[PDB]
Amino acid sequence: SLLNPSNAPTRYAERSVGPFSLAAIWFAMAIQVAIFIAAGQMTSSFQVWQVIVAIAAGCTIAVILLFFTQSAAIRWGINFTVAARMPFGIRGSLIPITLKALLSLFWFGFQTWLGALALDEITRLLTGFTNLPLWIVIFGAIQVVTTFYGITFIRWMNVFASPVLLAMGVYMVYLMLDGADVSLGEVMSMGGENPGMPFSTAIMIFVGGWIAVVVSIHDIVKECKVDPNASREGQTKADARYATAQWLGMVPASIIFGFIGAASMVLVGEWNPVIAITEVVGGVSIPMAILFQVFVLLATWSTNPAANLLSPAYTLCSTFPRVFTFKTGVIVSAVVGLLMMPWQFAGVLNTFLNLLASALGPLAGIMISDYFLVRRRRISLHDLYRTKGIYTYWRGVNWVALAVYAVALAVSFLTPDLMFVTGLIAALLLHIPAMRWVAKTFPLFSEAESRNEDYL
Ligand SMILES: O=C1NC(=O)[C@H](Cc2c[nH]c3ccccc23)N1
Ligand code: NA
């Protein structure tokens, strides 16, 4: 048996996130340094308005993906890590999940770094003392302790950060434009003086940004509010209402701040607004500096925990259920995370983001397909928490599913600028015959699936 209180499905009465709250989480979750860089570097290949469009487009495909990847977690309250057990093995799932927990972990140490940079700047702008690693640890630690409070903290922290972050951001655009004596419309076409990159791969970069979160949203949305006595059409509007809430959360947030990163690049040659505003205005007071850094910190805190630390936590406490608990998995994830020292990753994000999409495109495709197409939303919680059942396949691993992943990954390389969308579509479609084959050896349903409601 693999069940423990932390890795257990989330009971209807325990659920706490409705549609407004999820929008309020996503809005603050999208406001984070990294998109300055991405949208900034994009000004190299396109002008600002197109970048904004590549952002809105990439945001929209992500949401279309969310509508599907979130449906089982909302309805059944389950983990990502737990949910992967279905198509891949009970243990075989650990392979893609380890890939993904690693990715997830990589982002955590990265943003902790950016956060640390911020706190260290506030202090050295007061005390001149400029030790970074200590502020690294201290921040990693603080996140761990606020993450102990799971989604309860996340949800309260993001509702108050959101408008503040929204305001700090709208202010930023006024200060730049003003101090440079430029209208909004003028800046809207200042970029793109070195074309070469296709616009599709631009969209693919901003999708590649959130692919990890989208593919494992479970860990957030297993906390969402559901009415168990809906219907097919009421369950679908529920899905659509949530997906819509995520759209209104990540789009308007990441457009304003994507634009800020782009504007910085194009006005002054740097994606970082500290520099761009400092120059254009010719220095700023120590308060107003400290301020900016308070922003960065507030913008990191609203993204890192929820987006980067939750899912490996749940991976530990759900694979080693008597060894780890949520809180302990949080401690082990933030330590490994920082010990990956990701701040030394050479290159630029864009290509990394191009890496992230074509690497998880089939994973999202296989999960959407197994649950929606193969099984028809008809799942067995019982067997998900037991070493030997209908999801055990060949001694814990479903090799045919690991094959479909490879194959789809291959075909993906035949269309480099759309890698992700072919690999998703390929994995999606192949899972069907592959699964109609595996179904001749192993059963797709179980009697114990009638105990589903016992869990809830
Ligand atoms: O899956 C992810 N977890 C993270 O922290 C990053 C977030 C992230 C990094 N770069 C971006 C550019 C645009 C939008 C989001 C991002 N991606
Ligand atoms: Na944030």
Numbering used by the authors: 11 to 466
The authors write:
Mhp1 from the Gram-positive Microbacterium liquefaciens is an integral membrane protein that mediates the Na+-dependent binding and uptake of 5-aryl-substituted hydantoins (Suzuki & Henderson, 2006; Weyand et al, 2008). Mhp1 belongs to the nucleobase-cation-symport-1, NCS1, family of secondary active transporters (Weyand et al, 2008) found widely in bacteria, archaea (Ma et al, 2013), fungi and plants (Mourad et al, 2012; Witz et al, 2012; Schein et al, 2013). The structure of Mhp1 comprises twelve transmembrane helices (TMHs), which include the ten core TMHs characteristic of the superfamily with an additional two at the C-terminus (Weyand et al, 2008). The core can be divided into two motifs, a bundle motif (TMHs 1, 2, 6 and 7) and a hash motif (TMHs 3, 4, 8 and 9) (Shimamura et al, 2010).
The structure of Mhp1 in complex with L-5-(1H-indol-3-ylmethyl)hydantoin (L-IMH) was determined at 3.4 Å resolution. The L-IMH ligand is clearly defined in the electron density, residing between the bundle and hash motifs (Fig1A and B). L-IMH binds in a more extended conformation than was previously modelled for L-BH with the hydantoin ring reoriented by 180°. The hydantoin moiety mainly interacts with residues on the hash motif. It lies approximately parallel to the indole ring of Trp117 such that the two aromatic groups form a face-to-face π-stacking interaction and appears to be oriented by hydrogen bonding interactions with Asn318, Gln121 and Gly219 (Fig1B–D). This latter interaction with Gly219 at the breakpoint of TMH6 on the bundle was not apparent previously. The indole moiety of L-IMH packs between the main chain of Gly219 and the side chain of Gln42 at the breaks of the bundle helices TMH6 and TMH1, respectively, and forms an edge-to-face π-stacking interaction with Trp220 (Fig1B–D). Overall, this region of the Mhp1 protein forms a hydrophobic pocket that accommodates the indole moiety of the hydantoin as shown in the surface representation in Fig1C. Trp117 and Trp220 sandwich L-IMH in the binding pocket. In the IMH-Mhp1 crystal structure, there is very limited space available in the region of Gly219 such that substitution of this glycine with any other amino acid would result in a clash of the amino acid side chain with the indole ring of L-IMH.
